[PDB]
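User: Structure with magnesium ion, tokens only please.
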Amino acid sequence: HSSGLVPRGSHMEAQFFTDTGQHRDKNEDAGGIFYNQTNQQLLVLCDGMGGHKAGEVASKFVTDELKSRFEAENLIEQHQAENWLRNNIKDINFQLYHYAQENAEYKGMGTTCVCALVFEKSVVIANVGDSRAYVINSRQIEQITSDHSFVNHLVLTGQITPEEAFTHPQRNIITKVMGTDKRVSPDLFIKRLNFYDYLLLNSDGLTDYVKDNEIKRLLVKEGTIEDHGDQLMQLALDNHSKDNVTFILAAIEGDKV
Ligand SMILES: [Mg+2]
Ligand SMILES: [Mg+2]
Ligand SMILES: [Mg+2]
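Assistant:
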């Protein structure tokens, strides 16, 4: 191929926050923040399905596989990142499918997966399910991913409005999830970072109970990542979330020190 320059080192200050909540037996969300051999950064969040068996097994399996595969990589170029995410998510989905089929205790298990590979000026995001990725600044909160949910199908075909989807009785139904089929087609996105302050990955335990404008209002106020993460978690619980709540907050650097 034609020659080009090595990616410039790029990290975001990022932190992972998770809580079982007071309404679930287990925390079936999983995730983390991982680094490859050249110190590129991968953010991972998985929501194991509460309505099927063994959601915690599925979410931990996908997270641990992404951790192992990424930590072993040396360097991923930005123009190869979509392929890397697509290929590894497809392989992990296939492994998870057979793991579920063979172990009777885990039959039917599955998980969402949203993940983000960080570059200097952009982030590359892969999504399977109804966990989410957003970017936030003082003027806008933008959801990057599209929920693979039945209610989002209804929204995208004009059958219900977004506000109706927020209180719809079938909001729980997912239409694309890791582990249920041998094949999966993740959605891939590239988002330029230039004028945003935060990248947020989250499970639906946050956004089923906290609206986008509340998230934006909280994150735009002065505060550290640790203050914002503690307060965003408390907001989900104060808004009566009945689910595990998990998110990664990653600060986008503007002016250098
Ligand atoms: Mg779950
Ligand atoms: Mg369970
Ligand atoms: Mg959930």
